[PDB]
DNA sequence: AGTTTTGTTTTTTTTTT
DNA sequence: AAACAAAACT
RNA sequence: AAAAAAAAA
DNA sequence: TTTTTTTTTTTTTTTTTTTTTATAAA
DNA sequence: AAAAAAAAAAAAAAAAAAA
DNA sequence: AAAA
């Protein structure tokens, strides 16, 4: 079955013919007999046909010469076989050689092209490095599977039948009781969209909307069953988008889809560590056509605008701007409340939904949309999409016969996640509204539910009544919706005053009772909150220790191993900090850093100090992750939510408020509080406050009255001013005291303020006039804000907040280090200006795109290499002399520059620079460090010199302790290797004008010095010419 | 008059369902 | 993490 | 080897 | 209830102790 | 020669007792 | 070598 191979899109001739036929198809074809839906499927057939014609022709053309020579040789060899003479064997000898020349040249090019691709990526956080740490990828092929007989089979036709029949049954059964659905939907109170909102859904599609979706499609994804890729639509969006608009407008008008929109391919993937004998162990994934995903993406974006009107904030899955940790922290706070309570009669239930996305009944889903008030053009298009979807299984690369999808949301569809949530919201609203299912009361807060997609946790009081009523309600929803739970797989914590009462409740209820812990949303919830460290963080250390112990022999430099820690370990560490930000002992961070460094330095002591790696200006932009500062950044981030004071944030309100509530709304940028007895038992919030204050005093800020203090603050409320005055000021003039104005500004700065000024209570204005015009209030409020203050006050989005705080903490907690560049300046008798030390650092960043070439320079500048001087100190044995055996003290400058065995190579390099006709002094700082004197700092040739010198550095380092000269031919070979890698990259990324500038003059010199014997032996020949 | 800093944009991988 | 463009500070 | 949201580099 | 003094913890700096056997390619 | 670890000193917060 |  055909797929477009994306490489064809690159090729300027193939591209030109497609543009010709795309225009020519449509302008020929458009006549009033076809519907536009039929005309679109006809267009796709012609395109698929033409791509086959172009691929076949191109392959035939590229081979044409070897095709000819094979014939030409074969008749001459048969002419000899009939009539033999020596010159026929001469001719055979020549042509058969040229056959070998052509065939090897093609073999080289493919090997050099793949090497070039790897050369750009090596040691970078990219798919090659990701694959290195992963296991070997298990093949799709399925040899053997079991029958429901309890029997085992290997016959291909039996296994094809048994898989297909199983999936065909799951999707088959559509409910018919529509009258009973309407009753359930009427029973409860549900939201509605207003007119203005409904006008937004039903508005006509436009071209700008389509191109915005095309531009954002992910690249390198599998195509659907018609085999066109996202890269095709991106490439021809100029010609296609006019016709795509005509298609969607015809769908709006008529409610009819093209037949291809219904098709999908199901691929089966085996589950890890699971027994392939059983069909249940595979997981399906569905591939839909890209044109159908474009339409579905349009619809999902429209409904996403409204979704916060429809869905309560107890649901956080798939919702823009919500966080999964909101439910984790709320749940831990509920468990603490129960642990503290004197009378315990409570239950916490984690509910196991079964295959929820597949089992939703489509008629109930469409009725739900009407009750929320979605109807018209938007509802008509959604109804068309569910009219007749079908799937084909693809097993062992073989396409099985299709079956209808009569239940479920479409498993690979943009629109399915939100449609599932909207249906589940009907159940969530029923549970909240039923007063005989009792929630848990936390001061002014009641908590019943938290949801994440289909995952559900429930918090109940008086369980023996309350849990029975919950099960009844779910049974009723199951009948109409199709949604189903496995009650024995569901786990609960049960709290009772004594064990007789426990035995009774357990007798009646079906659930599995958990004694220590329950896995939830990636973490462990514990029955007592005192065990959070033991169940969450002690295991996380053990997991990282064993994971790095597996990797220890991977073929990777210290540069690549640093990137492994950032790629694999850092994300799971951050996730655990963000879910459970409890006070952690210092030993946790000591074990974590020791483990991580021991891996990076391959169990030998560090070659470069962690303090130099700490900072991005040093070591050419290679940097080591600081886990203490990521921890501190995560703990402090909570203060942003306190200042925002949002009603969606109920996780923040759920902590014990025994002494005094609401204190967190007042803390940030506001008057200090007399009493310290608040927050006595706080798990999260009291520790957040202590970290916030410590950073403010490290900055020597005054945190308590600021250019960002609110009008809704203790500062104003300690004045006795009526709440109507406060709300008047916010509604008219904005929310900061600075928006009022202090001192001479007090209202005068705008006419809107003095327009407001008359409106306020006579006596309140005198109180406010006194405070705002005082000397200290003017001084404190008028100062310029720091970048730290700007983070918490200014930003409307929580996005990016850990990375923003972490970059500040790096500047604040910065520490002093030795500089290797200074030691080099002592090693030579010279002083480097601050401008030279800057050039050394910039060169170390910009000498290459490849980390392979950059690493060699970084090691040279940062004094990586061992020397006999250093080695004699370590062994404390006084032989400090040069391993090469010239009879001299082996300083690092001797090893690189001065040794008489190395000196003939560096003189060779200087002969090439004179053939380039550059006049450059013979100074060790230019090749070793990239420090040019002031005349040459700007020059146009530095790109060339950088390649010559780094090639020479490789050549010396390869024989570091060997008693022989490095040789000119080894240097030429290394330099030509780099040339080859850069050439294929320069084509692939269309940089070729730059490449020719750098290499062209150097290439001419390298070729002029070699003999044809040497060029043949080492395959040195031009790729430009 | 030039260089440096700050923010957005395009590209990778990992967390949950 | 990289690159590119705009504005302020040296 | 697909969909959604979130996070980092 | 606030003020004053002492005690405890955390962080920063200084000083001492111990090391690895060549490197790049893979 | 160079990096990391360990100990000592300094500062700030909390508690205890008296005014 | 460490991709599809
Ligand atoms: Zn020597």
């Amino acid at each position: 079955t055909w797929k477009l191979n994306n490489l064809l899109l690159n090729d300027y001739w193939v591209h030109n013919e497609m543009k010709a036929e795309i225009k020519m198809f449509f302008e020929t074809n458009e006549n009033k007999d076809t519907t536009y839906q039929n005309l679109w499927d006809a267009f796709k057939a012609v395109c698929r046909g033409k791509f086959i014609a172009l691929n076949a022709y191109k392959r035939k053309q590229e081979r044409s010469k070897i095709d000819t020579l094979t014939s030409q040789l074969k008749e001459l060899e048969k002419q000899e076989q009939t009539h033999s003479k020596a010159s026929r064997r001469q001719e055979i000898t020549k042509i058969r050689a040229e056959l070998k020349e052509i065939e090897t040249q093609k073999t080289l090019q493919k090997i050099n092209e793949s090497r070039s691709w790897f050369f750009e990526r090596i040691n970078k956080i990219d798919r090659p490095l990701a694959r290195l740490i992963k296991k070997k990828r298990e093949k799709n092929q399925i040899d053997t599977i079991k029958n429901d007989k309890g029997d085992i089979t290997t016959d291909p036709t039996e296994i094809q039948t048994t898989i297909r029949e199983y999936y065909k049954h799951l999707y088959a059964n559509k409910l018919e009781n529509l009258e009973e659905m309407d009753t359930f939907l009427d029973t409860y109170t549900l939201p509605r969209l207003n007119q203005e909102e409904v006008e937004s859904l039903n508005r006509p599609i436009t071209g700008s909307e389509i191109v915005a979706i095309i531009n954002s499609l992910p690249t390198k994804k599998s195509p659907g069953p018609d085999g066109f890729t996202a890269e095709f639509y991106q490439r021809y969006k100029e010609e296609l988008v006019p016709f795509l608009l005509k298609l969607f407008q015809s769908i709006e008008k008529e409610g009819i889809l093209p037949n291809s929109f219904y098709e999908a391919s199901i691929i089966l993937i085996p589950k890890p560590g699971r027994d392939t004998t059983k069909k249940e162990n595979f997981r399906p994934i569905s591939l839909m056509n890209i044109d159908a995903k474009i339409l579905n993406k349009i619809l999902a974006n429209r409904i996403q605008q409204h979704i916060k009107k429809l869905i309560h904030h107890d649901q956080v899955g798939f919702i823009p701007g919500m966080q999964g940790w909101f439910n984790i922290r709320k749940s831990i706070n509920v468990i603490q409340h129960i642990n503290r309570a004197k009378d315990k009669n409570h239950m916490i239930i984690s509910i196991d939904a079964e295959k929820a996305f597949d089992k939703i009944q489509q008629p109930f889903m469409l009725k739900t949309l009407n009750k929320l008030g979605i109807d018209g053009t938007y509802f008509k298009i959604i109804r068309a999409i569910y009219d007749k979807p079908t799937a084909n299984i693809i097993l062992n690369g073989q396409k099985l016969e299709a079956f209808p999808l009569k239940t479920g949301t479409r498993q690979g569809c943009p629109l399915s996640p939100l449609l599932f949530n909207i249906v589940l919201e009907v159940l969530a609203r029923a549970i909240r509204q039923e007063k005989e299912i009792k929630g848990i009361q936390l001061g002014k807060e009641e908590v019943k539910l938290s949801l994440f997609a289909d995952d559900m946790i429930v918090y109940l009081e008086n369980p023996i009544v309350s849990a029975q009523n919950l099960l009844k309600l779910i049974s009723n929803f199951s009948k109409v919706s199709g949604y189903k739970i496995n009650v024995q797989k569901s786990q609960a914590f049960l709290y009772t005053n004594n064990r007789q009462t426990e035995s009774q409740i357990m007798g009646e209820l079906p659930f599995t009772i958990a004694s220590k812990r329950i896995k939830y949303l990636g973490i462990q919830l514990t029955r007592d909150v005192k065990d959070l460290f033991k169940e969450n963080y002690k295991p996380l250390l053990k997991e990282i220790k064993e994971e790095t112990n597996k990797w220890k022999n991977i073929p990777c430099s210290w540069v690549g191993r640093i990137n492994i820690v950032k790629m694999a370990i850092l994300p799971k560490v951050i996730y655990r900090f963000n879910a459970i930000p409890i006070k952690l002992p210092m030993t946790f961070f000591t074990e974590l850093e020791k483990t991580t460094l021991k891996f990076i330095w391959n169990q030998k002591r560090a070659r470069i100090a962690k303090s130099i790696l700490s900072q991005k200006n040093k070591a050419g932009g290679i940097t080591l992750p600081d886990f203490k500062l990521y921890y501190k950044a995560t703990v402090t981030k909570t203060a942003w939510y306190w200042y925002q004071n949002r009603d969606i944030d109920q996780w923040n309100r759920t902590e014990p408020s025994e002494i005094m509530p609401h204190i967190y709304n007042y803390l940030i940028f506001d008057k200090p509080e007399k009493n310290k007895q608040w927050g006595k038992d706080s798990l999260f919030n009291k520790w957040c406050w202590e970290n916030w204050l410590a950073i403010c005093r490290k900055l020597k800020l005054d945190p308590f009255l600021t250019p960002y203090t609110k009008i809704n603050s203790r500062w104003i409320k300690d004045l006795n001013v009526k709440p109507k005055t406060i709300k008047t000021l916010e509604e008219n003039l904005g929310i900061t005291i600075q928006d009022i104005g202090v001192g001479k500004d007090f209202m005068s700065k705008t006419p809107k303020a003095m327009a407001t000024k008359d409106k306020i209570d006579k006596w309140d204005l005198i109180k406010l006039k006194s405070f705002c015009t005082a000397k200290e209030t003017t001084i404190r409020v008028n100062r310029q804000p720091t970048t730290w203050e700007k983070i918490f006050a200014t930003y409307s989005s929580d996005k990016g907040l850990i990375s923003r705080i972490y970059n500040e903490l790096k500047q604040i907690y910065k520490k002093k280090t030795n500089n290797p560049i200074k030691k080099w300046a002592k090693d030579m008798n010279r002083h480097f200006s601050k401008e030279d030390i800057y050039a050394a650092k910039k060169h170390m960043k910009k000498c290459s795109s490849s980390l392979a070439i950059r690493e060699m320079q970084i090691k040279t500048t940062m004094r990586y290499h061992l020397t006999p001087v250093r080695m004699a100190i370590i062994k404390k044995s006084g032989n400090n002399r040069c391993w090469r055996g010239c009879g001299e003290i082996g300083t690092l400058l001797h090893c690189w520059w001065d040794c008489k065995l190395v000196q003939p190579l560096w003189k060779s390099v200087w002969r090439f620079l004179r053939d380039l006709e550059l006049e450059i002094p013979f100074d060790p700082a230019i090749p070793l460090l990239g420090i040019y004197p002031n005349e040459y700092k700007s020059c146009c040739y530095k790109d060339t010199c950088t390649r010559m010198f780094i090639a020479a550095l490789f050549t010396i380092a390869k024989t570091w302790n060997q008693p022989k000269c490095p040789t000119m031919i080894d240097w030429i070979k290394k330099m030509w290797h780099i040339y080859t890698m850069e050439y294929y990259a320069a084509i692939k990324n269309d940089e070729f004008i730059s490449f020719v500038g750098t290499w062209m003059k150097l290439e001419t010199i390298i070729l002029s010095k070699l003999s044809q014997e040497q060029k043949t032996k080492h395959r040195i020949f031009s790729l430009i010419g």
Side-chain angles (χ1 to χ4, degrees), chain A residues 300-523:
Chain A
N301 285 351
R302 287 181 180 204
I303 200 70
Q304 204 182 57
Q305 292 178 225
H306 307 297
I307 198 65
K308 284 175 184 174
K309 173 59 171 287
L310 305 177
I311 311 298
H312 193 236
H313 60 261
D314 296 320
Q315 168 69 259
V316 308
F318 317 134
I319 307 304
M322 302 294 281
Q323 310 277 330
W325 65 262
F326 296 173
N327 297 349
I328 302 174
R329 292 189 197 174
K330 184 162 74 186
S331 305
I332 294 167
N333 287 338
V334 176
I335 295 159
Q336 189 180 34
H337 176 80
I338 303 165
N339 289 167
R340 293 177 93 261
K342 293 168 183 174
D343 174 19
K344 290 174 173 75
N345 198 238
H346 299 85
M347 200 161 76
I348 295 177
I349 313 168
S350 185
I351 277 174
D352 189 54
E354 186 148 54
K355 293 190 179 167
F357 284 77
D358 304 331
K359 294 189 174 189
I360 289 306
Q361 292 295 330
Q362 295 165 7
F364 184 78
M365 185 277 278
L366 297 165
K367 282 174 174 295
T368 299
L369 297 179
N370 288 157
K371 198 67 166 185
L372 308 182
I374 298 153
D375 59 61
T377 293
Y378 189 90
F379 178 76
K380 170 178 171 180
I381 297 174
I382 289 190
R383 192 176 58 199
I385 290 160
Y386 281 90
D387 178 30
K388 59 208 183 171
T390 65
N392 290 96
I393 292 185
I394 300 191
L395 183 65
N396 305 330
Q398 191 166 126
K399 179 183 166 191
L400 307 185
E401 189 202 336
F403 58 93
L405 299 173
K406 284 175 174 175
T407 72
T409 60
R410 298 209 73 172
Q411 269 273 15
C413 182
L415 190 57
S416 158
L418 289 192
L419 292 176
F420 180 84
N421 274 0
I422 292 167
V423 174
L424 194 64
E425 190 61 14
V426 177
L427 175 66
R429 290 184 181 264
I431 297 162
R432 283 191 290 264
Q433 196 197 304
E434 277 295 313
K435 296 180 189 177
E436 282 197 40
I437 301 162
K438 280 179 172 56
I440 293 175
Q441 194 72 37
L442 309 175
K444 300 196 183 184
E445 305 301 337
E446 188 200 38
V447 292
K448 274 169 176 187
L449 258 59
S450 304
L451 302 183
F452 187 113
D454 67 301
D455 189 25
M456 176 182 293
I457 187 157
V458 179
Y459 315 113
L460 303 179
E461 195 167 76
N462 186 224
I464 207 164
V465 174
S466 193
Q468 297 297 359
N469 287 317
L470 181 75
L471 293 180
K472 288 186 180 187
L473 173 60
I474 295 169
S475 294
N476 288 345
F477 184 72
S478 290
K479 292 169 196 165
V480 296
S481 69
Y483 172 95
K484 185 255 172 162
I485 73 165
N486 189 343
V487 295
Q488 287 207 347
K489 287 199 170 188
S490 300
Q491 289 155 293
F493 296 137
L494 172 63
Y495 304 89
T496 67
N497 292 305
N498 66 307
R499 286 180 185 176
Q500 193 172 49
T501 301
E502 187 182 45
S503 77
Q504 189 177 37
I505 299 163
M506 285 175 168
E508 300 197 345
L509 292 175
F511 305 103
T512 288
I513 303 308
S515 63
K516 291 185 172 186
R517 63 190 171 104
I518 290 171
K519 190 162 195 183
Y520 176 65
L521 203 66
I523 64 74

Side-chain angles (χ1 to χ4, degrees), chain A residues 994-1006:
Chain A
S994 171
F995 172 95
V996 172
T998 301
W999 286 104
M1000 182 83 262
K1001 200 173 185 169
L1002 181 55
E1003 166 176 312
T1004 306
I1005 299 169
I1006 295 164

Side-chain angles (χ1 to χ4, degrees), chain A residues 882 884 886 894 899:
Chain A
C882 168
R884 314 194 184 119
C886 71
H894 183 78
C899 189

